[PDB]
C-alpha cells in the first residue's frame, strides 16, 4: 500500500484523516494522494524528489496565468523552489467534475463549453509568447520523433503485428510535423482533466488538473486531445471560435490526434496503470 | 428594478442558464457582489470604483500567484465587472481553539500565511501592483481628531489622544503584504475532515504593503491574546518591539470602526465603536 508505506508523513500533512479512506492516482515520477481539499505528491524515486522544486515553481507560474479557470495551487512556501529535493508537494484540489460527451448533444451547451475551452486555450497560447513563462517551463526539441521511439520501445512488445502496423503509419506522420514551441501546452488535456460545475446552470469551467506534462509546445497537441475525446464536430466549433481552423493547424491536429491513444497507453505503461493501459491499447492487440 | 434585473444581460453571459432571481447579492465597499455557486461578480457602485476596478483585478492576479499556503479569489473574467473564484470553507469558531490540538494546528497554518505575506513584501509584482501609502497612522490620527472628537466626551477625547499619540510614535513600516482586515470572518477552513485545514482568505479590498503587526492585531482581536501568543511564538515574532506595535494598532480598532461607520453612514457601528469614548 502506497498509503500504508507513507502513513506517518500523511498523518502530519493531513492531521486526523484516516489514510485508508484516501485515494491515489499514479504518476510517472510521483504518486498523488487525494484528500478532500488538497493533493499530496509523493516522489517515487530520488530523481522524482529532485524534480518537485521545479514542479512547485511551474505550478506557481500556472496559478498566475489568465486561463479563465482554476489550477492546482502549490501550498508550499516559495523558498521550496530553491531546494535540491522535496519529500512531498501539496497542491490545492480543483472543484468540479468531467463533462461526459453526451452533454454536448445539446447545441447551446456545446457552444458554452467550446467558448470556455477557447478562453483556456487562448490564455495558454498567449502565455507561451511570454518570455518569463517560456523560461520557467520545459521546452524539449524533437519530442515527436522521440515519442515515436518510446512507443516502439515500450508499447510495441505489448501489441499485435496488426497493431504494430497501425501504429507505424500513425508514428511516421509525426516526423513531418513542424517542431512548434509557441504555446503553453497542458499535454494531457483529455476530458477527465477538465472540470466543470453544473449545479446552478449551463456548464462552467471550474479548472484543469494533471499538469505533469506541461511544456512550451504546439497548441495542436491540446486541441487533438479535445478532438480525441469529443470528436470532429465539437472540435471544429472550438477551432472556429478560437480562430484556429486554418488548414495548417488542422493538419497538425489530425496527425497528433491519431497518436493520442498511444500517448495515453505510454503514460499508463510508465505510471503502472493497468486498466488505463488496456484501454489505450484497444485496437492494437 | 434592482441589481439582478438591471445587470441581467451581463449575468446571462457570465452565468449562462443561471436564473438570476436565485442568486444572492451583498452590499460591499463600493462594490455590489453577485454570488453564484463557484464564483462572484463584482460590479462597481460608484464611478470611482469603476475606474479603480482594472487595478483591483491586477492585485487579485498578483495575490493568486503568491505562496501563502492557501487559496485566494482568482480573477476568472474582467470587462465594467470582475469575476472572482469563490474560496471554499467557513470561518473557525473561537470555541474550536479550546482543543489544544486544534489550537496548535490552526496556529501553525496562520504562521505559513503570515510568512508568505511577509516574504511577498519583497516581490516585484507585489511592490509594483499593491498600494504602499506613507504616513498611514498620522493621516488616520488627523482623520479621528477631525471627525470623531466632536462626537466624544472630554474623557473619551483624552483616552483617544493617548492612543493616537502612541500610534504617531510607531515606525512607518512597509515590509509585508498586509491583508488589512484579517479577522476570523475572512479566513476560511475545511472542518470535519480531520483537524481544521486552512482553505483560503477572502476580502482583500484593503490590501497593501505595510506592517504585519496590523494583521497580527486582527488575529488577536478575533481569537484573543492566548491564541495570538501561540502564533507569535511559533512564527518567531514574540519579541518586545513587535508586541508593542501590535498592542498599539490593536488599541485603535474601535476608533477605526467608528471612523469607517461615521463615513459610511452606519449608525450602529458608530455607536458601538464610540462605546468607551462618550
Residue numbers in the entry:
A (entry chain B): 2 to 286
B (entry chain A): 1 to 79, 88 to 286
Please, what does the article write about this entry?
In this study, we focus on a resistance gene cph, which encodes a phosphotransferase (Cph) that confers resistance to the antituberculosis drug capreomycin (CMN). To confirm whether proteins in cluster I also confer resistance to CMN, three proteins, Cph001 from Streptosporangium roseum (accession number: WP_012891209), Cph002 from Streptomyces sp. SID8364 (MYT78782), and Cph003 from Streptomyces filamentosus NRRL15998 (EWS93654), were selected for disk diffusion assays. The polypeptide chain of Cph001 is folded into two domains, an N-terminal lobe domain (Met1–Gly97) and a C-terminal domain (Ala98–Arg286). The C-terminal domain further divided into a core subdomain (Ala98–Ala140 and Thr182–Ser246) and an α-helical subdomain (Pro141–Ile181 and Asp247–Arg286).
We then performed mutagenesis on the codons coding for the conserved catalytic residue Asp189 to generate the Cph001D189A and Cph001D189N variants. Activity assays revealed that both mutations resulted in complete loss of phosphotransferase activity supporting that Asp189 in Cph001 plays a critical role for catalysis. After multiple attempts to obtain the crystals of the wild-type Cph001, we switched to focus on the Cph001D189N variant, which is more stable than the wild-type and can be crystallized at 4 °C. Crystals of Cph001D189N were successfully obtained in a week and the diffraction data were collected at National Synchrotron Radiation Research Center (NSRRC) on beamlines 15A, 05A, or 07A. The molecular packing of Cph001D189N belongs to the orthorhombic space group P212121. The final model of Cph001D189N was refined to a resolution of 2.3 Å. The two forms implicate conformational changes during enzyme catalysis. The closed form reveals that the α-helical subdomain moves closer to the N-terminal lobe domain when compared to the open form.
